[PDB]
Amino acid sequence: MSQVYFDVEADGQPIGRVVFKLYNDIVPKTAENFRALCTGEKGFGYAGSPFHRVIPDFMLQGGDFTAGNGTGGKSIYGGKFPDENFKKHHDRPGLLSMANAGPNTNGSQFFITTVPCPWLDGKHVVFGEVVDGYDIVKKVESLGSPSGATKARIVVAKSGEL
Template identity: 60%
Template sequence: MAAIQTTCVFLLVQFGKDVEKIILRLRNDVVPKTVENFVQIIKGVEKNGEKLSYKGSYFHRIIKNFMIQGGDFDKGDGTGGKSIYGRKFEDENFTLKHKAGVISMANAGPNTNGSQFFITEIETDWLDGKHVVFGAVVEGFENIKKIVDFSVKNPGKKNVKIVDCGVLSAEEAAPYELKEEDLEKYL
């Protein structure tokens, strides 16, 4: 069976003295515009003289048995962030569903996607049709739980930081290749 076109990225997240890696497989085949936005910000793209980058930003909203939210790289409190397409861009589609361990766009209502995203700790099907899922954790899901536990024990908005991020090479991403026979799990 053929492999599906995806992109794999990593987030290196520091909380307390721990630094842990999360690897995400992004679904270019389903939501190419949303994935392109995320990947360009992962790379640290410059737009209109301003650098858009997740590196150095914080997970500003962490809720046990729900999700961790980040991506507000300019204000750090959930009120900022922007996309490579301008301040906001439209919802691409709602094909992928909110299972445990997916990455989805945070928004303030329909068609208000920017740079903020969240990674689910559990299945959150009540968000289906409201937030665009664009990938899933393929390595390091246990680190989501560690981040949540750390945050519960150490409340505060600026204590879980993305210290590095990037795109995996084709060779590095090979173990996370998505096969056609696996597609059913993600719908």
């Protein structure tokens, strides 16, 4: 299970780091796409992608590195790639899953769950979980609003794999 770490800066001030662990063996294509975007060796990645939609106590979203407004995003496989499976479910807080606009519409956007989401099962592919920095996740969550607009501007300054 490959590990992913992000450096989060809010209002130009670093606030902490969040570490994710991916279910590569269960969801290969999604993990590979996420790994490629995080590494940034292809000339593009999550560097500079803000959290454009954070709903407190519900979910965090991000990964828009082309427009920074929730409309952009792509994938190593192209504009979109088909789904794989739902062997994992939104059963625990902090699960990392892909955000899409329907079947086979997966891209670069992702969302992190803060509470169980049984209703989201069978719709979004879960491919990771938070292993460290959960305190930073809560700190980022506290800055959200019910409408999803963040009180402060939060941007992922750096991303990498470990």
